[model samples]
Target: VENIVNINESNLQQVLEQSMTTPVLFYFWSERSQHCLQLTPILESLAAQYNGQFILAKLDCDAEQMIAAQFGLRAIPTVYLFQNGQPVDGFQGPQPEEAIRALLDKVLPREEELKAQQAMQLMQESNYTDALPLLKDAWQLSNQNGEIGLLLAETLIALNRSEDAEAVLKTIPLQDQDTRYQGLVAQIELLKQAADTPEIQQLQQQVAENPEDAALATQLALQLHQVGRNEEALELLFGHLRKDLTAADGQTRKTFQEILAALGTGDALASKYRRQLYALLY
Candidate 1:
């Protein structure tokens, strides 16, 4: 037997109060909702999986009309993730067990999420063949998360599978995007441009011959960045900036400056590379 809680106006404040410490997984459902029925067992399993990290609670919208309406609940079978006592993210409609696992992977400190992160790390390093199983497993666990989508797409793109990457990208809902995903979107756009150009191998030679040409360096760096070669792109761009920050009508300097600006000087990546830059320069 599983424990499920019913929420109401009288207890709503109390429910939210406890969520401030750990995450609250709230499900709003009605008896007639087929989608909710299908999702309930999965949620129960997930609640079991994460243990005390999250609280899985449900509200019957029909009986708790006042509570549902107060939160602006427009649909039955609505799921809300509450952290710090506020609704952070959600999904609409029916979601498979895999999809549920995907998002839940991020919420968990469990052993499985750790292994998936290791898998994604390997994949991110461009080791697609080895990464496929890990990513596929992660996907099987939950295919609806932005992190999984982004990592999987990156893996496919590395293996020269832009079409598959694009297809996967299309499936990631906008609501799932975290702050880091903006760069992932740009990366996909970059890959789409060079889908079959066969220029990467040839461009390597061009760059070697004209190492000081800031214009060519910028273009190649952009290509590299598009293909998830972030560190390489940073190297090329930073090299261009140091060699001649004023080259290509100062576009090299301007683009590098903009990237730094976009990432923000105070950002973690910025600080990380700031150390790398110091190591390289001095």
Candidate 2:
């Protein structure tokens, strides 16, 4: 189950057409459909375990009859495996998880594909912290396969372990880099720029508690600037500047000047804030 896709009047044709590439389980059920309740979970369990090799299309036959009629579905829990755009295999009533898996195994991708799927499932959930090891394991199983490498690297980045992520991405050759691979590479630098320091985090907490504290804001701004959050830092600095440039202590003023300087004279943000600073001064 790459998340069970609910089948309805609209998606029935599209889902069936998708059956050509991926085997789809058409589980037709309704209210008071006795065997359906029991059989549904078995299908679900198999779908979740099977990953994307098949789609479990749960249709409420009571509400949606077009599909049921199209398939001539008579029974309550008439499950069908739609492959190559037609019903290739299926069963009625309850089938144990093992039996369902036996049917699925014939159509599903191999063990390694399932491992990658499992890793992605964790990744999609933003459970990057947990996905790292599984992705690493998948990487191992794939013999340092590129796709797994990208996923592992991406996961590492999510964990804020940019260096570790870099190590993984560096293994991919220049030619092998696809759009996704380069995007992953770009993400590392982007993350590196946005990487938060211990000091920044501490200052952030302090500033959160005391918004009026220009000194704390200055410190946090500097930290934000250091981490490649220059725009955020500048915006924060400008917020303070708009209130009172004169209120900024000497060091905070210097910090602001330094940030503006580093941003460059031609930079739009620098120019915009520069005018604001001048207006405050004069």
Number of the top-ranking candidate, with lDDT as the measure: 2
In model 2, which regions exceed 4 Å deviation? 49-51, 115-282
What TM-score number comes out for model 2? 0.42
Our tally of clashes for model 1 stands at 2
Error of 2 at 123 (Å): 14
Native-vs-model 1 lDDT?
Answer: 0.71
Model 2 scores a C-alpha lDDT of: 0.80
* Error in Å for residue 42 of model 1: 1.5
* lDDT tens per residue, model 1, 185-232: 687787556542466657767989987778887777666655645556
C-alpha root-mean-square deviation, each candidate: 17.1, 14.7
The deviation in Å at residue 272 for candidate 2 is: 59
32-124 per-residue lDDT for model 2 (tens digits): 877877887777776776567688999888788776787788778888888989888888777677888777778877666667888899999
